UniProtKB/Swiss-Prot annotation, chains A, B:
Reaction equations catalysed: (2R,3S)-3-isopropylmalate + NAD(+) = 4-methyl-2-oxopentanoate + CO2 + NADH
Biological function: Catalyzes the oxidation of 3-carboxy-2-hydroxy-4-methylpentanoate (3-isopropylmalate) to 3-carboxy-4-methyl-2-oxopentanoate. The product decarboxylates to 4-methyl-2 oxopentanoate.
Binding of substrate, residues: R94, R104, R132, D217
Name of the protein: 3-isopropylmalate dehydrogenase
């Protein structure tokens, strides 16, 4: 399995190396035939090549089977031309691979219900995967405009756009608890009804997965009242943008969440947290998100679901045994990693 | 003060009479010059006149200074032509009075943090008022359509639409903690930027109120993480629809929430709960929402803020002293009401 590693800035190199230690560990244990190469990306790239996404890196992601991203950005590059900002290189990466779906999981690990803003009774068992459509919708819809007296934006969706995001959700659900919930506003909007119709049609080719439909406003209530009753949730751009964020607060710590973007090209797996440059090089950076991105990679890029679950149970234990500083512990990056490996056998 | 009372169906007459007992009580205590008359509305109206919103009632709301609504609807009328359904009469009512703003408060009464799905630490102190634009937006935007291959809906807003809803929020904030937060998606949508610009302009005439802007997706996280730090929240139709529902789960019981619709005409105050016909006539119906709608009426329709707060503190105590059956108590409608009156002196 070929993996393109883009460490990035700040704590990127530390947390990414933590994930590689787990991957290499598994490779020796199962002979995965893991082959990887690190490439410049982000600020490091701007400083070394002048562009956040240099061509050798573009070639690297093109030839790779998966991308393990670290963290990009930093105050140092914020005051630069947009076309060359680290954030831009990130957008370019997604375009080059035609990644149309964004996977954002939110789970409350056993024993960590205390961190959730929700009552332990309700926070317990949460394990939801929000699949958000990234390319279409109101964010890119036309016509759009603004004048001194009015403003307009269009929520538009074509059948192919809905069909493809819907497919990654079903395919993604088979790997989990085989239950998908499609969110829309069908009872008021034409786009909603169209979205509902299409997903219901698409589902016919997935008899082993159960499909359910819900209105965005109702789903917002459910995520706070009974988030644990959901598995895979698929929805539009703006709807998925709101819902992903809502669900992300559930665990009570942004530092533990990974994410992935799927499409026609090479998949991208990355931790949701920033680069935290002021902590770079001290150790202490919580590698959880990075290791979980490694797990996401195994599951979605290579189908090694059982191995992904193994790494997941490993970090879960690690969090309780040697809590990272952010969870009130004192275990540095290496310390935490060691514990994870300790449970990877 | 002239009040038009529309009891409605199910528990409507019981809970509305509970609110009237409080109002009449206050009238004797402060000589408010309260004058009211009940009119048919809802199913009762269909059964007696053939239409859910008969003309004598239309004249009644036109001549009244406020409307105290009970509860409409019931399985009995669900299988009827849309034009004559109780739900329709409700829509007609809002149109006749050009009510463009919907006020939906969500508060966790002291001692009742236990019912919230949020941790007591975070549920404590919550008292938010969501002001939602009702007439414009994507729900009514054009062009809109659908074909075998595509679907589109338009989020459109004209300056006057934004200006008016914004004004009820500032005016509504002065009566509370003088802090308004305008929600939008300005960083991505033209409509967002336009909405932000207009509200910022409108705020200039309200120097005594503090204005803050927030992105809908960020606001979704805040309502779960730190809802207590907000006072008045104003936003668009679809955004307010989602946010009102999110905030409504915060208290942990739909039966305690009132609501109001403001505009050019006679204001409408009504409890959010259904008609619960299977309980009609047994007593036991929790009058909290109705009494709180009476309080909302005093505050928004007549400006008697201090009296509204008095009724609010009354029910708050009542909930702890003689909890309604829904809160695990056994106090029936009359019992609960008596306790409220007991604290209204």
């Amino acid at each position: 399995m070929k993996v393109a590693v883009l460490p990035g800035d700040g704590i990127g190199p530390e947390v990414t190396e933590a994930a590689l230690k787990v991957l290499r560990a598994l490779d020796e244990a199962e002979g995965l035939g893991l082959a990887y190469e690190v490439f410049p990306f982000g600020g490091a790239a701007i400083d070394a090549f002048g562009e956040p996404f240099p061509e050798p890196t573009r070639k690297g992601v093109e030839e790779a089977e998966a991308v393990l991203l670290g963290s990009v950005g930093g105050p140092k590059w914020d005051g630069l031309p947009r076309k060359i900002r680290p954030e831009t290189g990130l957008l370019s990466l997604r375009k080059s691979q035609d990644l149309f779906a964004n996977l954002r999981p939110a789970k409350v690990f056993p024993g960590l219900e205390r961190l959730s803003p929700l009552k332990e009774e309700i926070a317990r068992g949460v394990d939801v995967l929000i699949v958000r459509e990234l390319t279409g919708g109101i964010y890119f819809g036309e016509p759009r405009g603004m004048s001194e007296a009015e403003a307009w934006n269009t929520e538009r969706y074509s059948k192919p756009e809905v069909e493809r995001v819907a497919r990654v959700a079903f395919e993604g659900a088979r790997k989990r608890r085989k239950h998908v919930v499609s969110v829309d506003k069908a009872n008021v909007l034409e786009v909603g009804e169209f979205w509902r119709k299409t997903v219901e049609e698409v589902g016919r080719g997935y008899p082993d997965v159960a499909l359910e439909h819900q209105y965005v406003d109702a789903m917002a209530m459910h995520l706070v009242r009974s988030p644990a009753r959901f598995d895979v949730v698929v929805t539009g751009n703006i709807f998925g943008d709101i819902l992903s964020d809502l669900a992300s607060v559930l665990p009570g710590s942004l530092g533990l969440l990974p994410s992935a973007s799927l499409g026609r090209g090479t998949p991208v797996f990355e931790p949701v947290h920033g680069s935290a440059p002021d902590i770079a090089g001290k150790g202490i950076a919580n590698p959880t998100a990075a290791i979980l991105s490694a797990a996401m990679m195994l599951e979605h890029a290579f189908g090694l679901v059982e191995l992904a679950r193994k790494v997941e149970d490993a970090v879960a234990k690690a969090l309780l045994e040697t809590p990272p500083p952010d969870l009130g512990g004192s275990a540095g990056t290496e310390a935490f990693t060691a514990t994870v490996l300790r449970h990877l056998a």
